[PDB]
Predict the 3D structure of the following.
Amino acid sequence: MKILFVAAGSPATVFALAPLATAARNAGHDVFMGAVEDMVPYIASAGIPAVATTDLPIRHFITMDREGNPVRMPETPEEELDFAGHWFGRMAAGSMDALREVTANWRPDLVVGGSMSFAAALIAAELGVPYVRQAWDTGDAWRTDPAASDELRPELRALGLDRLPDPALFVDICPPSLRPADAPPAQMMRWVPANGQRRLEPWMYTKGNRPRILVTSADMAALDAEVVIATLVRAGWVPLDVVVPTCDVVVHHAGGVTALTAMNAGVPQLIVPQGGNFVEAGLRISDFGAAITVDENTPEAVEKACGELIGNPSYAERARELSAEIAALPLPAEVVGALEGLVE
Amino acid sequence: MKILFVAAGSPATVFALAPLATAARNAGHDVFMGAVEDMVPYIASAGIPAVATTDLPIRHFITMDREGNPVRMPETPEEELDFAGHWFGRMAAGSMDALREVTANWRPDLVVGGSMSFAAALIAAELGVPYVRQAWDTGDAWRTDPAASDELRPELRALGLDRLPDPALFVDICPPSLRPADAPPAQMMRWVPANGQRRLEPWMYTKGNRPRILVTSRGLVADMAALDAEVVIATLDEVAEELRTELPGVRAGWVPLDVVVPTCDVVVHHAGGVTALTAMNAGVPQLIVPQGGNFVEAGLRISDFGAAITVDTPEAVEKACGELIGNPSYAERARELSAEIAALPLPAEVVGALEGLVE
Ligand SMILES: [Mg+2]
Ligand SMILES: [Mg+2]
């Protein structure tokens, strides 16, 4: 069958969907993935045929309303949820022209969207084909829905709907221990780490004598550890999937799929705020005991936390528990059958 | 487990192995793929972690022996088989230092090589882990082995072997109807078309009413474009700008075969690599050309089956094209081959065979 995957505005939204997309391709399905123009190279880097859904970047939808007037960044966790619902809603509305033109020439039998790829729900409803929602991180997929519903009121009304439609299938990659008490039924799936590739250097897969700390996007100068900085004491391009398993600490902001890659490898995490706000997903990992949550702008806080994550085995113990949970989940190749069941 | 894939010197050798490698990765295995430096970006383009097995290009192994002496180019299919055995052998010998170094730090539990990735057999024997040979096209995987076993006699001797070892498993992607009478037993696998990707443009996945003929990497464009069919020319990026300005109004340049082939009525190629499989998979008739007069056997078998024409010149390509479009037989035979391919075990299932070899 033809399956259209719909990612969003950032590389993690592409890679969240890559394992299922590639599994579907490997089962003989014809698979396209769409995202904003800036993300098309990221889709291509996963080896998946790539289409653009808008020629505007995520910043355009984040920083301005539909009329082009500037909108401020959110300041609280509650504002975060609401503001994100709106920007993802704007991006979705802005994606419809290109999705219509693509699907007029290559008509999918099934549409798969990430957590807040709301254009996937809309185009699926327009075509009358089933819509699958895949969680693109361990955060609650539905958490921005009320605001997104309000943003998309006009588009939803044109389809005869009062709110965002329920998916035909919800596919969840969150380990059971981290799923909220109010989580809906889901087809579970093991997310297998994936990211773009270049050429591996020996250090990427060979750990030295000292503890290895990966920072994704001075402190650490007294730890006597090997620090690797993953950018655009070694710096530069770092394939997370290959390098994370060699690490003892991963330092990130719980945006994207980095937390999942760390948990999958049983590696303790140090989680800093994203903007001025800790991400809810990251707090739940911290609560479980597989990470430490820390404000970087307190001097020595990061240094102290790294020391704790390296010297106290319990964090790694909890990380390996999460790793075990992930490994027990249905494979992407298995989940392809659930997709097939929706159209036959 | 850790699985090392070993491709070779051309993009098809990478893409031939990509479906099983990505399926193994998707099953939770740690997967690396090695090839010559020039092919590393092609491995990367498949989304697979990539290591270089040698910094030397394929031309070095083809044109000179290990001692720097020039090698005489083959003039016949028979000479070609011995010639390829020796040059793939030299490429394999030149790959061992890097493979030794990689596997000292990241030790695989299993090694999978393409048809003539002989360094895969050598490194697996040295490590004492199972070796899987996967056919990388519909041609006979073993057909250069005698010359390859001569080329690698010293490396093989050091491992206590008199010739190239039998793989622990042979995985074959050749449709049953095209397998020769003497084909060895295999685990069959459905090959799924894969290649590098870049932004799709609408023409790539839109078929028109007018027949579409794909040429893989002038008088033909003028001829064929009068008036029945359009021609799409797949090229490398070095010559894409040159050919566009030499042939205005023609789709020429980067072409993703997996996306474009299903829209075509004919695929025109020389039967190297995985193009024949991509055409057959989509049920598309093929026009096969020779490089001088060095007919690829795999292509002759597809023509013998009736899903392709092998034609020897500017005017005669036009003729075979009219035939492959006009006579419905050719597409009928191609769809039969497509059906045979769809019935073969999925890469996701074949991963279970790899797992069974270690446990
Ligand atoms: Mg104002
Ligand atoms: Mg000899």
